[PDB]
Amino acid sequence: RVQPIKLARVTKVLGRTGSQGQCTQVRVEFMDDTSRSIIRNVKGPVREGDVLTLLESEREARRL
Amino acid sequence: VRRACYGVLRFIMESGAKGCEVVVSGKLRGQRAKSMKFVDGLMIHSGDPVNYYVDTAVRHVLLRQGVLGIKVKIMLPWDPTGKIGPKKPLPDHVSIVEPKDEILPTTPISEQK
Amino acid sequence: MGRVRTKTVKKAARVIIEKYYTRLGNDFHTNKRVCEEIAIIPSKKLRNKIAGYVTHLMKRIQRGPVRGISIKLQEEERERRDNYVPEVSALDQEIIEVDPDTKEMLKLLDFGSLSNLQVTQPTVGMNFKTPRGPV
Amino acid sequence: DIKLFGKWSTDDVQINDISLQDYIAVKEKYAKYLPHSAGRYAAKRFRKAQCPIVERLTNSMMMHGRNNGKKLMTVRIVKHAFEIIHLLTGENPLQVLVNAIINSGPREDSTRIGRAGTVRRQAVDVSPLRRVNQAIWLLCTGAREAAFRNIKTIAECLADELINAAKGSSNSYAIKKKDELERVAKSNR
RNA sequence: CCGAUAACGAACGAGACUCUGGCAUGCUAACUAGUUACGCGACCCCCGAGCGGUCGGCGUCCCCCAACUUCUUAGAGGGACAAGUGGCGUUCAGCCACCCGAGAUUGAGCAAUAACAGGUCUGUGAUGCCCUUAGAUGUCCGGGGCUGCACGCGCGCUACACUGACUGGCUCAGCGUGUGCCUACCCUACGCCGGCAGGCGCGGGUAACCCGUUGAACCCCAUUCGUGAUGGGGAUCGGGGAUUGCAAUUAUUCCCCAUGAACGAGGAAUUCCCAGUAAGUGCGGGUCAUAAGCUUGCGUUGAUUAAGUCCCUGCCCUUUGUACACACCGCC
Ligand SMILES: [Mg+2]
Ligand SMILES: [Mg+2]
């Protein structure tokens, strides 16, 4: 029943958010399917190309 | 003090100086103390070059009401001989020599000397 | 970040690229040595900065015309502005297209009925002007 | 081939997930004889990625004031802990370390400034470098607290923390803190 | 800075500058700095090594009786400029990444207009006015006080331990000081006495010559302890012994033996900090007859986190509102 944990790759880093700069909005493309690319916000040091793991796919999205 | 400082200021400029500044501060006029600053010309304040272009003297005038301080700063003119003042140029002054024509647009020849 | 060149380094650079364009080049080192006989620069960190921005202008002046002048560029500004006179003028059209009203006006001047003038069919619809407001 | 501490070859360990593969540095290029090199790894950003992780673990054990420069003491602590885990489990000590880092890094956390429910507001997935940074910090704190007032030495307390983290048994302080971070993030999605 | 431009031409500040750090096997040199070489030794060798290994043992400016400047010192110079490549940018000003490079942002000093009823009359033979001036508010001498303790706060030191303490062994610094106008008071090698603090003789240094190859601490390597207020911690207190001084009581400081208290990581709050940084760790300078838990510098070991934001506290620019101008700690 539970959506399985997966792995997504950062195509571009949109910029900082959270009004303290702790979170960076990034554009993650799912490796399982290159077509599905969603925007997330991550905390910590980030750069293009690195792959982060996603406990669950779709939470929130917003343009800055 | 207004007239005396102006006369001092005019003497310094006439003698040849890039700038000057006199500040006579004390119990001028009434009991409340004020400072009068007469400044004209260039007058740097910061950096090392202050050490070799400006001359500062602080004097005390014991008038009846109290002590009336005097601060005089004179920026000396640059002089290659350096007797009248500093010999080093200001560090940020770049002076470019003027070239001649040096065109030579004519036919090439050989001068047998 | 924080390597903007102050006025002095830029302002000195422009003077020595108009005084001495021919001697200078696109090498930081060759130019940094000319700046040692053409100018009395008090500081070493200043000439290398001056020499550095000179290359940026000398690299740029080889292509575009930077505001700093140059005789060889100015003579071509002259040659193109003052010459390339077309052998056939643009204002010698063999046939001059003419609105009916202009032909009427030229008729009043009594300079109408010239052969070079050719009347044109007047436009119809009076559809000039742009639709008012947005949309 | 480089034999870290003169043994424990580096050309056999492996990282089970590509998410952390490029911020762990146990392979041949970042294989060193000893976890000690003043390599200027904090000069710029993502230079601590190419710092070998044994060096990263060593740099994090020197904490709580008493031990702020004592890298030689920490190197022998890592050396003694690595000898124990190979003896106590039977596989390559580096392999246990990489599994410990992989298994201890909290996959998501929570952070915001608005009016929080319990701790933080919005659940945010962490970066792969924060994964390693948190994993190393959690293991060291677990070994630190476990040996603060007991006869068991730092090397043994560090040894069991990496062994427990490499498996995940609700016994390592690191994974216990990791599971707690997941629950807060999950409850604060 | 680039650019538009009712502005044009300027001035100060910033920047440039000065010092410091990092590289120069390139130059100048060094018996007040050394290194290599050679010659003596002293040992271990010995198989036999022999241009063997070690020596901070001794010589070769004890001028004819080595060279050289790598290491040390300090002068003149060089070097780094966003210079080169790629990308972004109005392709301008510039920004990002990378190669080569010691270095692609080392730290300080100086630091504008205007102002504060900010601090100093206890720095001055700086000073106005006022006060006192022989039973002095002058000056000197003796004693006491500035330390006094129901309590509150601030800067710190020591800790709560085993990532430790203890005992022994091993092994590494750098700033910098050193005998005094008055002015009395210097830094100390070596030998002997003592358990220690110390004492007694002999020297060296006004100093790259002597202390001093500053044999520092942490650290390192072995020992004992073993999770207990314990060999943690050393507060309090008793006895005794030295040093300084004219004088040590209200203990100057130091040493020795005893007592071994709170303290088991600290509520609300709150400080500082981005790379040789924080922190651990000692060492010099100032004060100094006597003395550092202070301060100013120095070296040693050496990280976690971050390359962001305006959320909190504030700053800068523009627009806006205003009943404010002692200016929101305002006005009402
Ligand atoms: Mg400046
Ligand atoms: Mg004991």
Separation between the CA of D138 and the C1’ of E241 (whole angstroms):
56
Amino acid identity for residue D101 in this structure? I
- Least Cα distance to A3 among A27, A25, A22, A30 occurs for A30
Total domains present in chain A? 1
| CATH number for the domain that contains residue C38 | 1.10.60.20
Quote the ligand 2 centre to D61 CA distance (angstroms). 29
Q: Is the CB of C44 under 7 A from strand E?
A: yes
- Kindly list the strands in the beta sheet with B67-75, ordered across the sheet, starting from the edge strand earlier in the chain: B34-41, B19-26, B67-75, B54-62
Query: Nearest by CB to C16, which of B90, B93, B96?
Result: B96
| Residues D162/D139, Cβ–Cβ less than 8 Å | yes
C118 touches chain B (CB under 8 A): no
Can you name the residues that pair with A53 across neighbouring β-strands?
A7
H or E stretch covering B91: none
User: Which chain C residues have a beta carbon less than 8 Å from that of B105?
Assistant: none
| Residues A46/A16, Cβ–Cβ less than 8 Å | no
For CA atoms C6, C8, C11, C17, give the dihedral sign: negative
Domain of A19, in residue numbers: 1-64
Query: Nearest by CB to C12, which of B91, B94, B97?
Result: B94
| Residues D25/D101, Cβ–Cβ less than 8 Å | no
In angstroms, the CA C39 to CA C35 distance is 6
Separation between the CA of B24 and the C1’ of E124 (whole angstroms):
22
Q: Is the CB of B94 under 7 A from strand E?
A: no
| Residues C65/C84, Cβ–Cβ less than 8 Å | no
> Locate tokens 């956390």: which residue?
D109
| Residues A8/A28, Cβ–Cβ less than 8 Å | yes
Is residue A18 helix, strand or coil? coil
Resolution of the structure in the document, Å: 2.2
Separation between the CA of B97 and the C1’ of E141 (whole angstroms):
80
In angstroms, the CA C4 to CA A26 distance is 32
| Residues D135/D105, Cβ–Cβ less than 8 Å | yes
Is residue C68 helix, strand or coil? coil
H or E stretch covering A53: strand A51-54
What residue in B sits closest to C16 (Cα-Cα)?
B96
Given a contact as 3+ CB pairs under 8 Å, which chains touch B?
C
Joined together, the tokens standing for residue D157 give: 């307390």
Separation between the CA of C24 and the C1’ of E2 (whole angstroms):
24
Q: Is the CB of D103 under 7 A from strand E?
A: no
The residues, ordered by sequence, that sit 6+ positions from C18 with a Cβ below 8 Å of its Cβ are C68, C69, C70
| SS3 letters across B2-65 | HHHHHHHHHHHHHHHCCEEEEEEEECCCCCCCEEEEEEEECCCCCCCCHHHHEEEEEEEEECCC
Is residue B74 helix, strand or coil? strand
Tell the burial category of D69 from Cβ atoms under 10 Å away from its Cβ (0-12, 13-18, 19+): exposed
Bases of strand E lying below 7 A from some protein CB: 1-3, 11-18, 78-84, 92-97, 105, 109-115, 117, 126-129, 161-164, 218-221, 226-228, 264-265, 274-276, 278-280, 300-311
Question: Dihedral angle at the C-alpha atoms of D156, D157, D158, D161, nearest 10 degrees?
Answer: 120
Q: How was this structure determined?
A: cryo-EM
User: Which chain B residues have a beta carbon less than 8 Å from that of C42?
Assistant: 88-94
In angstroms, the CA C12 to CA B91 distance is 13
Query: Nearest by CB to C40, which of B95, B98, B99?
Result: B95
Angle of CA points C44, C50, C54, to nearest 5°: 145
Asked if the Cβ–Cβ distance from D127 to A46 is below 8 Å, we say yes
Say how many C-beta atoms besides its own lie within 10 A of residue C65's C-beta: 13
Domain of C43, in residue numbers: 2-62
Residue to test with chain D: of A9, A19, A51, A60, most D Cβ within 10 A: A51
| Residues D10/D94, Cβ–Cβ less than 8 Å | yes
Domain ranges of chain D: 1-189
